[PDB]
Amino acid sequence: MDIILGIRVQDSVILASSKAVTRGISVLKDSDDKTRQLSPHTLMSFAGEAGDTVQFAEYIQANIQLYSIREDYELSPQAVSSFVRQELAKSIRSRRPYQVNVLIGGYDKKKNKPELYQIDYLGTKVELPYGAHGYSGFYTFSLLDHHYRPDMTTEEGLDLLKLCVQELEKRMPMDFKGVIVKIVDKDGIRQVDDF
Amino acid sequence: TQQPIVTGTSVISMKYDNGVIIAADNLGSYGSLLRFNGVERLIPVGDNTVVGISGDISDMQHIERLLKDLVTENAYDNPLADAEEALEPSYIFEYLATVMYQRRSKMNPLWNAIIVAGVQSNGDQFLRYVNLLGVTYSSPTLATGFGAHMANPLLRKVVDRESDIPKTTVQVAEEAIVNAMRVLYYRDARSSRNFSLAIIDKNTGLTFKKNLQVENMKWDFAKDIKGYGTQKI
Amino acid sequence: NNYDGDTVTFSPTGRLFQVEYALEAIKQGSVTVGLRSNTHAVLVALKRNADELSSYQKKIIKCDEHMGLSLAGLAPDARVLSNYLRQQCNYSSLVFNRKLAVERAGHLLCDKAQKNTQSYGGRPYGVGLLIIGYDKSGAHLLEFQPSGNVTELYGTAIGARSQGAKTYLERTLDTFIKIDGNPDELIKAGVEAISQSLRDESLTVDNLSIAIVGKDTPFTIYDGEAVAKYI
Amino acid sequence: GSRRYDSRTTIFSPEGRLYQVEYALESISHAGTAIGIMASDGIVLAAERKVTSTLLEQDTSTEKLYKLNDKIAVAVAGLTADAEILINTARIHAQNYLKTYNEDIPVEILVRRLSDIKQGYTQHGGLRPFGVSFIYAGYDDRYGYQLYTSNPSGNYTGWKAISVGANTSAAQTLLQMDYKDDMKVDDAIELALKTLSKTTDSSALTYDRLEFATIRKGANDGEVYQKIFKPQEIKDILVKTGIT
Amino acid sequence: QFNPYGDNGGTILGIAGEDFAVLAGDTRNITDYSINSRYEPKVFDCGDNIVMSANGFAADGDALVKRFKNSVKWYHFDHNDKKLSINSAARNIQHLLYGKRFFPYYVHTIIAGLDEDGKGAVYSFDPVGSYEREQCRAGGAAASLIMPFLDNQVNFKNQYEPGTNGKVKKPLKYLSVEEVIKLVRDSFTSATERHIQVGDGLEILIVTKDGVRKEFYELKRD
Amino acid sequence: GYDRALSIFSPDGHIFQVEYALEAVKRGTCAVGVKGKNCVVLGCERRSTLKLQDTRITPSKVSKIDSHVVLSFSGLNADSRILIEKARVEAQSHRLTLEDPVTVEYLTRYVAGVQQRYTQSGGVRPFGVSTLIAGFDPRDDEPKLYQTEPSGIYSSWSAQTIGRNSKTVREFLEKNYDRKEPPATVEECVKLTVRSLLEVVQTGAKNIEITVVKPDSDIVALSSEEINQYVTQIEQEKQE
Amino acid sequence: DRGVSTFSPEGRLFQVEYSLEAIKLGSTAIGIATKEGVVLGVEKRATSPLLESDSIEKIVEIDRHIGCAMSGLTADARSMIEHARTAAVTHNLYYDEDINVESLTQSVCDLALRFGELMSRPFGVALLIAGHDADDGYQLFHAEPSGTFYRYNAKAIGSGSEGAQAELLNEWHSSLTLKEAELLVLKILKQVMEEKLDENNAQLSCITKQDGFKIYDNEKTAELIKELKEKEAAE
Amino acid sequence: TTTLAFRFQGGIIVAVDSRATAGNWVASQTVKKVIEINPFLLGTMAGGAADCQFWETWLGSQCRLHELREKERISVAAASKILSNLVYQYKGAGLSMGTMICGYTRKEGPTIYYVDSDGTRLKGDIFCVGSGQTFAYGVLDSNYKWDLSVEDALYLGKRSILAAAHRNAYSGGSVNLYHVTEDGWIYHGNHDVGELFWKVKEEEGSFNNVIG
Ligand SMILES: *[C@@H](O)[C@H](CC(C)C)NC(=O)[C@H](CC(C)C)NC(=O)[C@H](CC(C)C)NC(=O)OCc1ccccc1
Ligand SMILES: [Mg+2]
Ligand SMILES: [Mg+2]
């Protein structure tokens, strides 16, 4: 289970993603960044089958970067999420579907609002205040149902996120080797180097 | 991929001093039903080759047409079609062997086992086997199906190796083949009494014998057999 | 004139000019001779150089162990046609375990060249070939023209000044046909035949190219000091 | 063979011009004049129907002004049949974009796509180009109100006011004279009709010889409305501006 | 359901000498518990002083050999009658095998000859094309019986010099052609005793600078 | 499909369709490229026959292929969009597979390869476009300026011009540009580029476009007023 | 109009003959083969002084043991080079060896006549393909758009070809050293070039068994030019 | 199979075993699981022998074509990604590959990429791949330090393979060592386990589980 979490607060979106890469019986790496920057104000985290995850993320990244150059303009998070959903919805009826689940965290510069989209490998899109893929949601959703507000600050969002990770580290069976946390706001994307 | 429906059983053959002999019964079985009683499974090609075929009969008839078409095609723009550039057993076999291995590689085989018997231009005896898998081999004696298990042992007592071929006459070889056919009628539950036999000699040419029967059978001892163990009466 | 723009157009007298222009390319090519006896078949070819620094263009191509040809005209077209022969000789061996008959090899070349003369877009082959070979009916010599016409002959010559060698062979017909079991004498007759087509230049060690096939002789090509014996 | 009969539609002249594009532009110069004027609070599209008849059913007729989506419209100059092929392609492209990104297509992107299609017919395929020139009138939230034009060459450019079809030289001079940047829709309506009234080859400009449309933010609050004018509404605006 | 593969038995053996190389194989061909032929050649002279055998499913083996012989023919046509080196042949055979990676030639392939320095060479392949140059290799049905014997008697494995007691190994003295053929004959005689698919006859192809020579020996026919 | 050979040789060994494509480039508005010591500047002509234009939305002459490379052109405008699109796609494709942005030489070689392909492909005519491709290689501070043309040949230039009256501005650059000491600063490079265009342009109002590209993806387009200041300074020095 | 694959009344392909005229307009390229190596040299011919001459790439590596010089419509050569490089590397992959120079040349020449109504016209560029292999040693080939290739001891192509070839006729012998060949290419290039020969408007290269294919530095060529001037002034 | 590669102060150490099996049958003890792609690139082989051999020699052909076209060497990142993109096309077809693409360039420095037939491509400092990876990890992980000497690092890699050759039934034969620096790779010999085991046991005083 490749833990990926997301929380949308007052003025930003925060994505947390596990660092472990386990192939069989061995943890091959404990510092893996399961995310790609699609545009300056849009970040996508991902989790699923080996190989497919990165291949899909980089493919989406390339397409959005192509759009940005062509139009000299950044697509809204809503527009990027719809593009991603269609690719997955197309993929599910292919010969060999992309087995990838994603969270898209973005800051809409037009509306001055943070936005978090949860999309599974079938192409099921939902906009949420907080989201998760895989088994993480079984612990974190109910926990966030209790501790979330729409008017929370970024610092309160991080404390709330620490609470989620602590619960996961307590009750989940795999060692996912901690998480890499990234914040998406009006100033762009930045990584929290100490978590 | 398929399953064979109407089938032909053993084809047996052997080399002798001046040529080759080949034989096969005239039955087309439909499972345990002995459905068709007049099927010719030896198919001559020219006056120097006989192809004996076992297995699926529909596929046999297809192969029969390929060989008939092969003769037609070889005659095209060929003034020496009845002489130097006539079809050889080696040519006919390699053609079939190519087809059989191609068809197995497409996972759509011709469900057969084939023996090409004949005599070459230089008088050399030709005898080679090929089946649905494209597997090929040659031997002084060759047999398919039940014949492999029962006929080969009997024919190998006559020609056990290559050096025994010049020592083997046509009368001795035909005697061995006819005996083997009787043994198969005793023991193969999908055999018939009626069969065809072909001789290809380097001197006397192609002799094709039809409507042969298994004869001189031993059954009289059956009367003395009573019960399955303790039964006196 | 108005009827030579493409190969798909007959002239008012029923001529195909593009085919005739392709035939012209052969006449510009260097001379090559073919002849045979009952036991052997020989190709002799005068190779042509661009200048003194250049090599002498190869004229003879091997098709199988028992067959090969010499060319005159567009060399790339000879490569295409010889490649086709190699494949056809090879198909015959792999499928039928049978060496391809020289006569049937000629028929296949004829039909391949013909398709290019009746269809729009394409063009005729611009090369003439002399095919020799030894098969089940003995020695053979063929002459291929890109019109499609293939002809079996005792001896012949194609290329520039080929009429001289062709006349010599027409006189010598009764002599060289009898040269059985003697390869060197049959080549001598071929070298003497091609000599009738020479002007100014003579046969040197890197100029001459000979090939032979026979009863117990695979198709082999002789060049360089290997033909000094025959000069 | 077939080469004999090939016109070779996609070649350069010795001067470096595309023959068929140039001749297609000549065709368009005889088509009914179409004018587009962009204002601060909207866009006007005006166009002249070509020598009509009294027995033409006008209220159900459409030869000049077409709707591409709710935000974008086009004025046509040239072969109507050719224009409808491209219009239906443009309508599909807009819907493809909407399905993909869940946002209405930006005007320029739609214009570029149609212009790229036209370009293709001049470079490859051996087919004749589309004998059509478009005036695109549209709105999006990036650039706001926009006017573009495309021609058979596949080249497109943006405009404040522009004319296509017949008498563009005369029409462009009149627009260049009376146009100002702080202009409004009601004023632009008047300018468009006055320009057609002077450049027309007809004796007098009447309601039955016109197609008219406006793209206004004059819709209840922050949104855009397309108004394809009816015959009676064109008749009223002709009286209002003082032409009839 | 149709099974496109079969097992024709047989066993092959390649040994490389200092200036020679041998490729041996029994002449028996079988299906299940029956004998098809007591003499069906399995090792072939492929031209350019290269010998080859493809052991396992005979239909696939014959096809592969046939294709490689064809490859040699076209190598001469395409590259001015250049001699195909043993290392170049091996690489070519890899591509023939891997080309059918997803519907494999069901064979163990071995080729033998001389390298470009004139030394004896043996190359061994798996069914899907992985190859390796070796001094010694047995393939086929009785390969598990023969290879350990060759590790012991060719490469002197687990053998040491008396008196030293495990400290000093047996030196790797080269083997002559006469000494190698003895090991080959004993290898097949032993394999014939304990493996039912091995027997009838043994055909050895020896490769030297002078060419390709053949030797035939009888094996038990039970 | 339409397979007709449009680009073919003539008796004198010329491909007229390729040569007529160059005539289309000769007709196009003038474009100029000048590289300094630590920058490259792309100047472009805007013909003032077209007023009442909307300069916000009108397609700009200089196009970004990636964040570190730009492309300007002279010739058919519609044709240029096709090359620009292909170039942009290849730029992202290169980043995706090589994990490194294109070099300026590589991007040029690709665009030139596309142009060449259209000179010996059936059913197509050559591009009536010559391009100037400029930028900086990743993690490199050496300026790059390349030119391409319809035939498909490409080469690097210290300074170059293409389009109408390019013969005149090339004459200017050949005497004014020194290789041993190129324009050391951005100001000097822009000034030399504006000067070269002023030989041909007519009025220095909205007819000159300037785009400065610096190392590490630093690309900016100058405004009307900024360019007008260069135009003012050049002529005031000239009055002497 | 008329077919692209049409024969003339003399028995020549119009388009092939016309492409040969385009090659005559091209810049000069010279190749000389010796027992110590093969030398390749070209005229760069920059159209303007602002053009950075080092970007002119008319000599090109195909493999470590094969080099190539071009003359004519040089844009057409790019696909020919790409094919040659692929053919050389592919053969190494299939056969674990270097590919024969002749076989490489033959592969390139197979593209030549693949035109019709495949590509729309023949190539407008000639190639000098130089290399080394173990069988036939140091070799030099001239590959035309006709599909024909000749081997040469020495060869010149381009605008000054017939004048250069006549000069190569007299100067070449079988005992030439590599140094002697280098100077000889420079000598003949200087003779047929319009502009004065220097290290910036002319380029040298060679192929040896030991070091493989090498394009010469402008500093290295400059010395050979200076060495040439002195030896001509020596008598 | 046991293969490893790790980054350290003096560049990269690559160490592999030499065994090849077919079930319980030991098919070869002398196989080369390191492929010399170019003077600065190495590839490791684990999983399907043919798959690894074929596609990594193919990779070398693609890397050579790169430096012909671009007149510059291929990056380790680009080389590894060519292979990973290739196997991703074949995903589901049944390829079995576990590889490390190890090398050095100026702009990257010493770099190791783990490439997998599942499509996984990972950059990292330490990797152990094959049926014996766990055994090598145990020794390597417990004794690894960034500041080992080229001599101590070579030994650690060699020792880690030995550990795995011992305990893993499908690993063994011999140890092939490589060292990669600024100036390319350097072979450090074939080391038979039959002699190395006893040598290490005596000198190091380890392997007390064994009767010696
Ligand atoms: C260890 O990973 C090692 C690395 C190789 C580079 C040698 N791999 C193996 O030992 C491997 C077993 C793995 C998958 C557990 N063995 C093979 O790949 C094996 C090698 C030959 C030389 C014995 N080949 C094999 O098993 O053949 C595949 C096959 C079998 C039957 C039919 C078709 C294909
Ligand atoms: Mg979901
Ligand atoms: Mg036995």
Strands (E), chain B: 6-8, 11-16, 19-25, 28-30, 33-36, 42-44, 49-56, 112-119, 125-131, 136-138, 141-143, 194-201, 205-213
In the block, residue with structure tokens 């005996």:
B179
Q: Which residue of C has its CA nearest to B98?
A: C95
Map G92-155 to HEC letters. HHHHCCCCCHHHHHHHHHHHHCCECCCECCCCCEEEEEEEEECCCEEEEEEECCCCCEEEECEE
F chain contacts of residue G49, beta-carbon cutoff 8 Å: 174
Phi-psi region of F41 (alpha: psi -120 to 50; beta: other; left: phi over 0): beta
Who's near F192: CB < 8 A, 6+ residues apart? F34, F41, F176, F177, F183
Q: Are G142 and G155 in contact (CB under 8 A)?
A: yes
Q: Exposure pattern of E17-53 as b/e (b: 16+ CB <10 Å)?
A: beebbbbbbbbbbbbeeebbbbbbebbbbbbbbbbbb
Q: The domain spanning residue G133 has which CATH number? A: 3.60.20.10
Residue nearest to atom 5 of ligand 1 (CA): H49
Q: The domain spanning residue A120 has which CATH number? A: 3.60.20.10
Note whether F92 contacts A: Cβ–Cβ < 8 A: yes
Query: CA–CA separation, A110 vs C48, rounded Å?
Result: 78
Note whether H68 contacts E: Cβ–Cβ < 8 A: no
Q: Are A43 and A15 in contact (CB under 8 A)?
A: yes
Note whether F139 contacts H: Cβ–Cβ < 8 A: yes
Q: How far is the CA of A140 from the centre of ligand 2 (A)?
A: 15
Query: CA–CA separation, C3 vs C9, rounded Å?
Result: 6
E86-98 vs E58-78: helix crossing angle, rounded to 10 = 130
Query: CA–CA separation, F126 vs F106, rounded Å?
Result: 21
Indicate the SS3 state at residue C163: helix
Q: How far is the CA of B136 from the centre of ligand 3 (A)?
A: 21
Q: Which ligand is in closest contact with the Cα of E9?
A: 3
Four-residue CA torsion sign, F120, F122, F125, F129? negative
Candidates D158, D161, D223; CA nearest to D190 is: D161
Tokens for H73, please give them: 């060497």
Q: Are H148 and H48 in contact (CB under 8 A)?
A: no
H chain contacts of residue G90, beta-carbon cutoff 8 Å: 61
- Output Rg (C-alpha) for chain A, integer angstroms: 16
AA letter at D112: R
Give residues 115 to 134 of F whose Cβ lies within 8 Å of H: none
Tokens for B219, please give them: 């059954």
Q: How far is the CA of C117 from the centre of ligand 3 (A)?
A: 65
Four-residue CA torsion sign, F50, F54, F58, F61? positive
Looking at 3.60.20.10, 3.30.360.10, 3.40.190.10, 3.40.630.10, the CATH number of the domain F1-240 comes to: 3.60.20.10
Indicate the SS3 state at residue C203: coil
Instruction: Tell me if C121 and G112 make a contact (CB, 8 A cut-off).
Output: no
Contact call for E and G: 3+ CB–CB distances under 8 Å = yes
Instruction: Tell me if G52 and F170 make a contact (CB, 8 A cut-off).
Output: no
Who's near G221: CB < 8 A, 6+ residues apart? G186, G199, G202, G203, G204
Query: CA–CA separation, D184 vs D40, rounded Å?
Result: 6
Termini Cα distance of chain C: 46
Q: Are E36 and B139 in contact (CB under 8 A)?
A: yes
Q: Are D27 and D131 in contact (CB under 8 A)?
A: yes
Which domains does chain D show, CATH number per domain?
1-244 (3.60.20.10)
Query: CA–CA separation, B188 vs B145, rounded Å?
Result: 10
Q: How far is the CA of G99 from the centre of ligand 2 (A)?
A: 56
Query: CA–CA separation, E154 vs F28, rounded Å?
Result: 81
Residue B102, number of CB atoms within 10 A of its CB: 14
Q: Which chains touch G (3 or more CB pairs under 8 A)?
A: C, D, E, F, H
Query: CA–CA separation, D150 vs D168, rounded Å?
Result: 14
Residue nearest to atom 4 of ligand 1 (CA): H46
Candidates A4, A5, A18; CA nearest to A160 is: A5
Q: How far is the CA of E198 from the centre of ligand 3 (A)?
A: 5
Query: CA–CA separation, F91 vs C16, rounded Å?
Result: 53
Candidates C116, C118, C144; CA nearest to C130 is: C144
Four-residue CA torsion sign, A63, A64, A67, A69? negative
Instruction: Tell me if G92 and H65 make a contact (CB, 8 A cut-off).
Output: no
Q: Which residue of H has its CA nearest to G82?
A: H69
Tokens for E24, please give them: 């041996």
Q: Are G191 and G180 in contact (CB under 8 A)?
A: no
Query: CA–CA separation, E149 vs E17, rounded Å?
Result: 17
Structure resolution in Å? 2.6
AA letter at G109: C
Termini Cα distance of chain A: 20
Domain span at residue A124? 1-195
Strands (E), A60-152: 100-108, 113-119, 125-127, 130-133
Instruction: Tell me if G5 and C28 make a contact (CB, 8 A cut-off).
Output: no
Residue F17, number of CB atoms within 10 A of its CB: 22
- Helices then strands, each counted (H, E), chain D: 6, 10
DSSP states along F112-171: HHHHHHTTSSTTBPPP-EEEEEEEE-TT--SEEEEEE-TT--EEEBSEEEESTTHHHHHH
Candidates C217, C199, C137, C125; CA nearest to C162 is: C199
Query: CA–CA separation, G200 vs C123, rounded Å?
Result: 46
G chain contacts of residue F155, beta-carbon cutoff 8 Å: 51-52, 55-56
- Chain Cα centroid distance, residue C73: 10
Query: CA–CA separation, E146 vs E137, rounded Å?
Result: 9
Query: CA–CA separation, D74 vs D138, rounded Å?
Result: 8
Q: Count up the domains in chain G and report the number.
A: 1
Tokens for G180, please give them: 């002697």
AA letter at G147: G
Which domains does chain B show, CATH number per domain?
1-233 (3.60.20.10)
Query: CA–CA separation, D24 vs D14, rounded Å?
Result: 19
Who's near C48: CB < 8 A, 6+ residues apart? C29, C30, C56, C57
Burial class of residue B23 (count of CB atoms within 10 Å of its CB; 0-12, 13-18, 19+): buried
Indicate the SS3 state at residue H26: strand
Query: E104: Cβ below 6 Å to ligand 1?
Result: yes
DSSP-assigned beta bridge partners for residue B159? none
Note whether H51 contacts E: Cβ–Cβ < 8 A: yes
Tokens for D66, please give them: 């077409």
Q: Which residue of F51, F57, F118 is in closest CB contact with D108?
A: F57
Note whether G120 contacts D: Cβ–Cβ < 8 A: no
Query: H48: Cβ below 6 Å to ligand 1?
Result: yes
Query: CA–CA separation, C15 vs C173, rounded Å?
Result: 33
Work out the angle at residue C124's Cα, subtended by the Cα atoms of residues C121 and C125, and round it to the nearest 5 degrees: 130
- In the DSSP assignment, the letter for residue B37 is S
Query: H1: Cβ below 6 Å to ligand 1?
Result: yes
AA letter at D185: V
Q: How far is the CA of A60 from the centre of ligand 2 (A)?
A: 18
G chain contacts of residue F161, beta-carbon cutoff 8 Å: none
Q: Count up the domains in chain A and report the number.
A: 1
Residue H195, number of CB atoms within 10 A of its CB: 11
Domain span at residue E119? 1-222
Q: Which residue of F has its CA nearest to G114?
A: F120
Indicate the SS3 state at residue G34: coil
Candidates E166, E202, E152; CA nearest to E38 is: E202
Four-residue CA torsion sign, C176, C181, C185, C190? positive
Note whether H61 contacts E: Cβ–Cβ < 8 A: no
Query: CA–CA separation, E198 vs D121, rounded Å?
Result: 73
Give the DSSP H/E element, type plus range, for residue H67. helix H49-69
Residue nearest to atom 21 of ligand 1 (CA): E126
Who's near B29: CB < 8 A, 6+ residues apart? B6, B7, B8, B9, B35, B36, B190
Tokens for D241, please give them: 């501006």
In the block, residue with structure tokens 């004459």:
F171
Who's near D82: CB < 8 A, 6+ residues apart? D130, D131, D132
Tokens for A100, please give them: 């990838």
Give residues 205 to 224 of F whose Cβ lies within 8 Å of D: none
Query: CA–CA separation, G189 vs G63, rounded Å?
Result: 26
Count CA atoms closer than 13 A to C18's CA, side-chain side.
Answer: 29
C181/chain G closest Cα distance in angstroms? 35
Give the C-alpha distances (Å, rounded to integers) separating G216 from C178, G206, G221.
Answer: 63, 8, 6
Who's near F214: CB < 8 A, 6+ residues apart? F38, F39, F136, F186
Q: Which residue of E128, E134, E144 is in closest CB contact with H50?
A: E128
Who's near A75: CB < 8 A, 6+ residues apart? A39, A42, A64, A67, A68, A83, D101
Query: CA–CA separation, B99 vs B92, rounded Å?
Result: 11
DSSP states along D107-155: HHHHHHHHHHHHHHHHHBSSPPPP-EEEEEEEEETTTEEEEEEE-TT--
Domain span at residue C51? 1-231
Query: CA–CA separation, D135 vs D44, rounded Å?
Result: 11
Q: Are F18 and G76 in contact (CB under 8 A)?
A: no
Residue B116, number of CB atoms within 10 A of its CB: 30
Query: CA–CA separation, C210 vs C187, rounded Å?
Result: 8
Q: Which ligand is in closest contact with the Cα of A118?
A: 2
- In the DSSP assignment, the letter for residue F18 is H
AA letter at B63: I
Residue nearest to atom 1 of ligand 1 (CA): H1
Q: In this structure, are strands H98-105 and H109-116 parallel, antiparallel, or unpaired? A: antiparallel
Candidates H17, G235, A39, F54; CA nearest to D137 is: F54
Domain span at residue H170? 1-212
Q: Which ligand is in closest contact with the Cα of E194?
A: 3
Contact call for A and B: 3+ CB–CB distances under 8 Å = no
Q: Which chains touch F (3 or more CB pairs under 8 A)?
A: A, D, G, H
Instruction: Tell me if G55 and F113 make a contact (CB, 8 A cut-off).
Output: no
G204/chain E closest Cα distance in angstroms? 30
Domain ranges of chain F: 1-240
Which residues of H are part of the catalytic machinery? 1
Q: The domain spanning residue C208 has which CATH number? A: 3.60.20.10
Q: What are phi and psi of H73, to 5 degrees?
A: -75, 155
Burial class of residue C20 (count of CB atoms within 10 Å of its CB; 0-12, 13-18, 19+): middle
Query: CA–CA separation, G27 vs G44, rounded Å?
Result: 7
Note whether F93 contacts H: Cβ–Cβ < 8 A: no
Q: What are phi and psi of H16, to 5 degrees?
A: -140, 160
Termini Cα distance of chain F: 65
Query: E127: Cβ below 6 Å to ligand 1?
Result: yes
AA letter at E129: G
**H153 labeled part of a ligand binding site:** no
Give the DSSP H/E element, type plus range, for residue C103. helix C102-118
Give the C-alpha distances (Å, rounded to integers) separating D36 from D138, D192, D239, H169.
Answer: 11, 8, 21, 83
Four-residue CA torsion sign, F22, F26, F29, F31? positive
Q: Are C90 and C130 in contact (CB under 8 A)?
A: no
Domain span at residue G78? 1-235
DSSP-assigned beta bridge partners for residue A35? A45
Give the DSSP H/E element, type plus range, for residue E73. helix E58-78
Candidates E181, E56, E48, E47; CA nearest to E108 is: E56
Query: CA–CA separation, D29 vs D133, rounded Å?
Result: 10
Query: CA–CA separation, D232 vs A124, rounded Å?
Result: 50
Pocket-testing residue among H2, H21, H31, H117, ligand 1, by greatest number of atoms within 8 A of Cβ? H21
Tokens for F240, please give them: 């002497």
AA letter at D78: G
- Chain Cα centroid distance, residue A1: 14
Q: Which ligand is in closest contact with the Cα of A123?
A: 2
In the block, residue with structure tokens 């025994």:
B164
Query: CA–CA separation, C35 vs C165, rounded Å?
Result: 11
Strands (E), G18-83: 29-33, 38-43, 59-63, 66-72
Tokens for A131, please give them: 């989201």
Q: How many residues does chain E have?
A: 222
Q: Count up the domains in chain C and report the number.
A: 1
Q: Exposure pattern of B47-85 as b/e (b: 16+ CB <10 Å)?
A: ebbbbbbbbbbebbeebbeebeebeeebeeebeeeeeeb
Q: Reduced to 3 DSSP states, what percent helix, strand and coil does chain F have, rounded to the nearest 5?
A: 35, 25, 40
Indicate the SS3 state at residue D92: helix
Query: CA–CA separation, G105 vs G128, rounded Å?
Result: 10
Instruction: Tell me if E92 and G95 make a contact (CB, 8 A cut-off).
Output: yes
In the block, residue with structure tokens 């001599």:
H151
Residue nearest to atom 12 of ligand 1 (CA): H21
Strands (E), chain E: 11-16, 21-26, 29-31, 34-37, 43-45, 51-56, 107-114, 120-125, 131-134, 136-140, 201-208, 211-218
Q: How far is the CA of E52 from the centre of ligand 1 (A)?
A: 22
Map B71-126 to HEC letters. HHHHHCCCCCCCCCCCCCHHHHHHHHHHHHHHHHHCCCCCCEEEEEEEECCCCCEE
Note whether H128 contacts A: Cβ–Cβ < 8 A: yes
In the block, residue with structure tokens 């091995």:
E198
Using CA atoms in the order C71, C73, C76, C80, what is the torsion angle rounded to 10 degrees? -60
Query: CA–CA separation, B223 vs E96, rounded Å?
Result: 64
Tokens for B26, please give them: 């005239």
Annotation says B72 is catalytic: no
Q: What are phi and psi of H172, to 5 degrees?
A: 150, -155
Q: Which residue of G has its CA nearest to C75?
A: G148
Q: Which residue of F has its CA nearest to H85?
A: F97
Count Cβ–Cβ pairs < 8 Å, chain F vs chain G: 98
Give the C-alpha distances (Å, rounded to integers) separating G95 from B205, E95, H59.
Answer: 50, 9, 15
Q: The domain spanning residue H88 has which CATH number? A: 3.60.20.10
